[PDB]
Amino acid sequence: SVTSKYLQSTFSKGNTSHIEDKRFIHVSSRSHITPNEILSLKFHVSGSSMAYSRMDGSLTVWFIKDASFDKSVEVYIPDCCGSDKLATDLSWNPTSLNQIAVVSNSSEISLLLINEKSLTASKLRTLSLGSKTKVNTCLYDPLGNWLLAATKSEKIYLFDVKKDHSSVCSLNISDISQEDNDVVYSLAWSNGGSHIFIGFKSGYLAILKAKHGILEVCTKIKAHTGPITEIKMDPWGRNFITGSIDGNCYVWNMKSLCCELIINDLNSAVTTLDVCHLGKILGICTEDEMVYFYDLNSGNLLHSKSLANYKTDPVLKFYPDKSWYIMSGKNDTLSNHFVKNEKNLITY
Amino acid sequence: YERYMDMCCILLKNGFVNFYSIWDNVKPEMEFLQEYIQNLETELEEESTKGVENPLAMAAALSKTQQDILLFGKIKLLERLLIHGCVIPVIHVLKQYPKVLYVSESLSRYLGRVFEYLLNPLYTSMTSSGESKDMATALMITRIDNGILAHKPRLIHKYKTHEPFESLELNSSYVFYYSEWNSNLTPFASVNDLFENSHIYLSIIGPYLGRIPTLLSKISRIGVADIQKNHGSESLHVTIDKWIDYVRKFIFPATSLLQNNPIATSEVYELMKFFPFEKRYFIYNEMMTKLSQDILPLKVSFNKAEREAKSILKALSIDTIAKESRRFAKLISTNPLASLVPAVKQIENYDKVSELVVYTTKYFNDFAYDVLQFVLLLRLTYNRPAVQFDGVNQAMWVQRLSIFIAGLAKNCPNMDISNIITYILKTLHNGNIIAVSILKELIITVGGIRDLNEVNMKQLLMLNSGSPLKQYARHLIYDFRDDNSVISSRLTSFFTDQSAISEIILLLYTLNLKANTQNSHYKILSTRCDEMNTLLWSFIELIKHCLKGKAFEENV
Amino acid sequence: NNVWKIPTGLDKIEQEVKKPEGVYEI
Amino acid sequence: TGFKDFLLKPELSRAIIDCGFEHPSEVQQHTIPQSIHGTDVLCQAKSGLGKTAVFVLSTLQQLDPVPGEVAVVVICNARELAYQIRNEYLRFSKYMPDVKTAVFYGGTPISKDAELLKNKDTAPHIVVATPGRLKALVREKYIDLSHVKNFVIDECDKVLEELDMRRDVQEIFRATPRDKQVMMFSATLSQEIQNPGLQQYYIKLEEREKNRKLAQLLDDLEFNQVIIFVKSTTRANELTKLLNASNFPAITVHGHMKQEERIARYKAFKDFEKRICVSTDVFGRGIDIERINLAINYDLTNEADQYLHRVGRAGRFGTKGLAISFVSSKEDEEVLAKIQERFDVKIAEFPEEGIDPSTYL
Amino acid sequence: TTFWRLSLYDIHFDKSLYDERKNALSKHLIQNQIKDILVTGISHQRAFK
Secondary structure: OHHHHHHHHHOOOOOOOEOOOHHHHHHHHHHOOOOOOEEEEEEOOOOOOEEEEEOOOOEEEEEOOOOOOOOOEEOOOOOOOOOOOOOOEEEOOOOOOOEEEEEOOOOEEEEEEEOOOOOOEEEEEEEEOOOOOOEEEEEEOOOOOEEEEEEOOOOEEEEEOOOOOEEEEEEOHHHHHOOOOOOOOEEEEOOOOOEEEEEOOOOOEEEEEOOOOOOEEEEEEOOOOOOEEEEEEOOOOOEEEEEEOOOOEEEEEOOOOOEEEEEOOOOOOEEEEEEOOOOOEEEEEEOOOOEEEEEOOOOOEEEEOOOOOOOOOOOEEEOOOOOOEEEEOOOOOEEOOOOOOOOOOOOO | OHHHHHHHHHHOOOOOOOOHHHHOOOOOOHHHHHHHHHHHHHHHHHHHHOOOOOOOOOOOOOOOHHHHHHHOOHHHHHHHHHHOOOHHHHHHHHOOOHHHHHOOOHHHHHHHHHHHHHHHHHHHHOOOOOOOOOOOOOOOEEEEEOOEEEEEOOOOEEEEEOOOOOEEOOOEEEEEOOOOHHHOOOOOOOHHHHHHHHHHHHHHHHHHHHHOHHHHHHHHHHHHHHHHHOOOOOOHHHHHHHHHHHHHHHHHHHHOOOOOOHHHHHHHHHHHOOOOHHHHHHHHHHHHHHHOOOOHHHHHHHHHHHHHHHHHHOOOOOOOHHHHHHHHHHHHHHOHHHHOHHHHHHHHHOOOHHHHHHHHHHHOOHHHHHHHHHHHHHHHHOOOOOEOOOOOOEOOOHHHHHHHHHHHHHHOOOOOOHHHHHHHHHHHHHOOHHHHHHHHHHHHHHHOOOOOOOOOHHHHHHOOOOHHHHHHHHHHOOOOOOOOHHHHHHHHHHHHHHHOHHHHHHHHHHHHHHHHOOOOOHHHHHHHHHHHHHHHHHHHHHHHHHOOHHHHHHHO | OOOOOOOOOOOOOOOOOOOOOOOOOO | OHHHHHOOOHHHHHHHHOOOOOOOOHHHHHHHHHHOOOOOEEEEOOOOOOHHHHHHHHHHHHOOOOOOOOOEEEEOOOHHHHHHHHHHHHHHOOOOOOOOEEEEOOOOOHHHHHHHHHOOOOOOOEEEEOHHHHHHHHHOOOOOOOOOOEEEEEOHHHHHHOHHHHHHHHHHHHOOOOOOEEEEEEOOOOOOOOOOOEEEEEEEOOHHHHHHHHHHHHHHOOOOEEEEEOOOHHHHHHHHHHHHHOOOOEEEEOOOOOHHHHHHHHHHHHOOOOOEEEEOHHHOOOOOOOOEEEEEEOOOOOOHHHHHHHHOOOOOOOOOEEEEEEEOOHHHHHHHHHHHHHHOOOOEEOOOOOOOHHHOO | OHHHHOOOOOOOOOOHHHHHHHHHOOOHHHHHHHHHOHHHHHHHHHHHO
């Protein structure tokens, strides 16, 4: 019951700060409009940086140095990756401390090294592929050993990041799916780059081996009856969580690959999910503008809330180095959460 | 009491004292146990068959001995003797008094624990996950110190407790203390041993196997891999027959007990897919008729599911579909062949529930599909009159059922209604009115082939000209055959197999003649003959639309 | 099982008709 | 496709066929053949027999669309009825793209009506309106009626009895060409106003058991829709709040409430959006709902005619249904005794074991 | 065989309905009037002849 009180305190009068971004001051001036979006938001591994990209085209990055974003510098940058094209996915390159990979639904993958002394985001390199190929998702092996780039259909590329991003291998999606017109919806890496977990739209789930740089199909299981939205992994490495649009959220055992626990209070589709860095609490953002916080070990609801028709598409992410979580606010504005006197659950 | 019982359970397997000398002398006498058992049996059977109304807003406005038997004495001794890996005393006890399993659930869970440990090493040898075992590792703690990255491993410590199942509570891992409880047991070496020991452990756990879904998945995957291993060999039918018998006797009754857990049924059906469909229908029908009744926990579960299905069916609306659809999909996917029949009747004689159900078929897996086709054939073959009581008018359910079937063929494309088409091709021989009706609604709804009864001369003229004028004419006459090319091709593909095309055309033709030679009032004779004529014409328009080139001359 | 015991085949649909000629004795 | 015997335009025939019309009523077949020739018509019929369709089909037949020319003007008595007539014109003109229809009623800025009348994209050939607003438009020359060929007046009795309404309609009539087609339609033309299967049951019990009893009945009976008749607005609203609290989607309609929400919830339940509706005798007459198969009289009325009006909402057009009533006082049994003598019907006491579901479907 | 072989499409050329459709049809201008629908009318003239 300690975790329930902790979450309640994290939802209190204080212990909360508004992330002061461009959209925040925009709403402050125009309220005291059509909300663009938040395409994606992804931390650095060491828990001391953050990056995200709205629909306008501008990607913000913060260098966390304070709790309530007091002394946190902010490198705002205009619509990068072209003037017409906007960013859709980014990976933070766990190898170094500054590099970033960004994709813009085009045939060009941009590698930019963000600098903190100035506000200059200088394009370091651009990678290109076949002219028709339209990739939109990039990923980094959590050890910084492989890079993955995926299309909505009929292309999957793996580069070796060590040897100057030499194109290592590729694969046609129709060889992985073997169904009628499947479109990969979400990808994820295993803890320590050894396997790639892919969730198609027709419902299937595939596990590809990427040991020595040669992709191969290990297995395919008919997990869900609708498109798979998100795929997350437990940090301890014992189970991986699958959330779908048919209203189900399962947790699969890693050693044996069989369903072990099911979330049953759900009655709506899932838009995203996330699990804390301690592998203890599981946050589900359903489609009825509502968030839930479940317990991983037992599987019973321990906290609920209600978005109340503010920023229809929400986002949730748990810090990789503290028990804090960034959650969307009212009008596409981010809202930090903390307790200001508890860095981790154990200290509580 | 816990520690003392554990010490006695330890002593009671190294031979310090014999078991029955302890069993016969602990507090709850066998007679009081049997009395409590009869009370639980009667209360359960009543609350199952009759049921109880859960008060929601009822009357909310106007204008200890049970705990004793459960928590200590003989039952607690049995649970602990099971935890500590001494299976033979409890097997010998439950061989005599099976009803004891009703007292508490934990016996089934613990028996499943020992069986799952028994079977795990056989399971890994097949469906090979050992090559994939090397991916269960944790993320290293990364930190930036002095402006450089540094990786470290996470540190945990190990505690010993009395609870049997391992866990990891946020910093430390707990384990069962008596770490050599599995000394007396030897895992399986070959599937034959799995049969030989199923006949002992699973015949005891009974219909309660469903309390542990993971065992269903493991056994079903073992079956799938065992059948796949010898796809080439000549003896495949032997293994298929043997696994048929096994799934009939041990697994399917269990999966009939589940609670809103689709994936387990998905696995069991992924194994079932290898049988002849005759056998699947045998198992489904036997489960429906003889094993729902005459077995208590199955009966309880079926009655609960049925009452819940009717409760949901009373609350389907155009406004509440967003969540009721998900709930109905889960409930139908988990336990179909006893929760579908109320739905089939409700759409058999109500108007809009048909459209609602055809909307919600988008969500359930192949098991619900096969069972749905089963109950459709069931209703289509149930003994009842076809014509209305008044005169020669056809009854008022044929039409709604045919509309339902056409909606199925139109919307959900993984349905596999082949057997229904064999029903059509077969029962047309005797002139069954349901066949003709299903064919008419199939052609007119899926294909889109509107008739030519009322056509103004200009439309009639445009209807045979160059392609674009003809297309405009058809879209004016409210005909949508062009936009439905893919599903029309799929349905004609269903028809193509078993070569039903020529048989069906000849049947329709030679049936209208026999309809001409009947005796009735002319006011119905003329209409019937003309209706059959128009149906045949429309069918041939569909055939010429979908089969072109050489396929036509091949199958016409 | 009954409705699946009905024999289906091209040999059975022949059911040859009656010749047009009709003999002479709403 | 009975209208195909009318020998009309094919696109109009398709617009009628997609409107569900298949067999004309008596008044349609008796009036449309002669109104198509442009003759004046004065029609009296029973309400709800498709009197609008007659002149709607007539004017959609006789019109040849001229850009920017208003030839057809219909005058009604209300704004919501005007909206209904323009909706009828729209559902009748699905397959007629060149013709344009518009509606005029109070509560809207006159300048917006003017600018939509000047707009070629909204320049209407068919105008349905209230006489006052269209008078304010003609007298200000905001609309031109120098080419009107068709003049329809619905509910002409109230149009001619009220002095302001008759003066307005005459100001609109004098600004139109004298050689036009003229039509008047109304269900009531007194003499003072150019060459023109239901099952019936009852429950005798006490008040304090009603709330739980329905919670059982609404649980066991198999139903499409259910209606709940009450004698008061407070009890109805309370029972609806409790029923919606009971995981049973229910709506409430009665007096003491603004008309906007009444129309809104009425239309909503008509469309099968929820399965339970509760109302007082405000809907005792006139309502037409097909899917209602099970009726519960929570409180009986004072006279037998009101009870038969209540039960008339079920078993529409000689269809099957089920009715069950509550008896909790002396006058309830009194009216129960009087209904059988007047209507020759045995309202048996509802048995405890339940009735066969097929006896009412 | 000359009676039963033939049809209506090969026995009557109106050529008025084609023109009515072409004129009422005047994105890319609906794919250039449905690829100059008139090619079918030309083939129709050849067939009639």
